[PDB]
Design a binder for these strands. Sequence first.
DNA 1: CTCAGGGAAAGTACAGA
DNA 2: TCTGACCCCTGAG
Lengths: 273, 312
Amino acid sequence: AYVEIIEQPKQRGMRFRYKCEGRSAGSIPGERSTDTTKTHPTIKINGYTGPGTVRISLVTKDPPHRPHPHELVGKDCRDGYYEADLCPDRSIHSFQNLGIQCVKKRDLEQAISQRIQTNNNPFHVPIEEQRGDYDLNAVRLCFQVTVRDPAGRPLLLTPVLSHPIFDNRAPNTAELKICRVNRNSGSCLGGDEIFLLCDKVQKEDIEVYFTGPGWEARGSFSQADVHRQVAIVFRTPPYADPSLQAPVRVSMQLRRPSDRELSEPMEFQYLPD
Amino acid sequence: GPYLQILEQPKQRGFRFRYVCEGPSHGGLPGASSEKNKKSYPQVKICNYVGPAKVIVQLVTNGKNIHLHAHSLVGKHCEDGVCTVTAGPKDMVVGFANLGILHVTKKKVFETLEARMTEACIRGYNPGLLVHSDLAYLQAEGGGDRQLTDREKEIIRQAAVQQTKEMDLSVVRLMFTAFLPDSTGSFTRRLEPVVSDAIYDSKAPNASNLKIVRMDRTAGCVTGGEEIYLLCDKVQKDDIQIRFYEEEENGGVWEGFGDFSPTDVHRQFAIVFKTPKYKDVNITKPASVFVQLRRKSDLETSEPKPFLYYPE
DNA sequence: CTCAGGGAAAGTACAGA
DNA sequence: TCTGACCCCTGAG
């Protein structure tokens, strides 16, 4: 009898919201959820099906997964975590209204105290460890599911974690995204300037990665070329074949070296001489 | 008669109102005519050179009804919100070098306000028309902390509440006032006060200095309808437009505007538009002209940028 | 190296489907 | 039903 995640949380794109914003914060998308067809965090209870309950809280990203200061706001969410009863008719369960509510910096200690005072510690981490710095732009969902044993008594299953979810409000952990582009073709000799409009990026941690089978290169530019974190003016790299005689499509995408993240690919076409 | 007058109005734009947290030394309201590193500065002058003189200054609102603003003059001999100087010396032209404008937080507007209104009552140098006309009968007279009538102290906490509700913190004004020597050696001979030109905080997107940082293209066909990517400083997608202009012989009256919806404005820092058709789509030699960012609100512009039009 | 002075960033706020 | 504008770090000198 164990909990299995069959649909992880999308890791990037959603921003953590503060209390001061709308009462109804965001809702954590699935991972395969498409602009048209949306999906949500989904677990399956293997080796069991029937009555019981499920709780979801927030733990840090790294190993000693301690209670996280942020709160998991949304339907059936209180004191920082969501809790509701499982449907005895199904073994697969998805949650469509989970939202990270990021705390302010100066309420960090209060937040932890509320985690202790509330007995929210899925991994029963020593209390002396709940004092160390906390990464506030990354959290992990934690599924504490409780079933029933043959004696028909409460049986708390072993805690399971999802992939980490990052604060999109934060450029370093944000989802990379090319919004608009000057031109999408150029000579296989390179040297064509391109104006690229994008979501917030950190000039000291960004790249334009040109990709094709057997060919990898980068757009040329300097930090001075990054306009207010949202526009990049660069020069195209030379394609491999210096004497193309027909358009060859290749991929162009934003790359973040710190965590080697990549943006969805944009199509670029190299043309002859 | 003896009256006051200003010799160099405060530069209306290019200065940011510093919050407390911002910290010390950031700048200091520049003199309107600071064309170069001539480190300009505001300067008032009393006409009827009355030997010893006293000139003060407190910030005020920019609306129709002149009142006491919540922001305060910090630099120079500026204490508790207002600056004070002397004019007894060899001349009658006081200046005001280095003295920033502190930006107050919104929650603390009502507080600071009532606290600078009461102070405008238990302190002579402050009028009684900036707090409430029904109080003018309190002009410059004596000093020393005391308690104001609890009958009038209430209307004070009332004016605050009614003047906090619509106070614009992005703009402030200077209220210059001169007091002459009286009969008891107390500078309380008040001369008609004079307000300055509205100073705008170089942080409110609707009063910041406009600027084209770069364009992917600086030339286009006279036919127009060509897409251009323009990078600029903070602007507001609803109060902005790109104007192209040319100064002809009969006074350059020709202008055109870049075509674009607001969705074409990227995170306030970039605009992608289409060039406007040039006046004569029949020219045979290139026509050099200028492009500039212009705020649709205050019709304020950015440094004109050269744009070349070439034959179709 | 100070320091005017900007670029980031944290935290606040509504509105438009 | 959500989603989508309003602290320092340098570059001068």
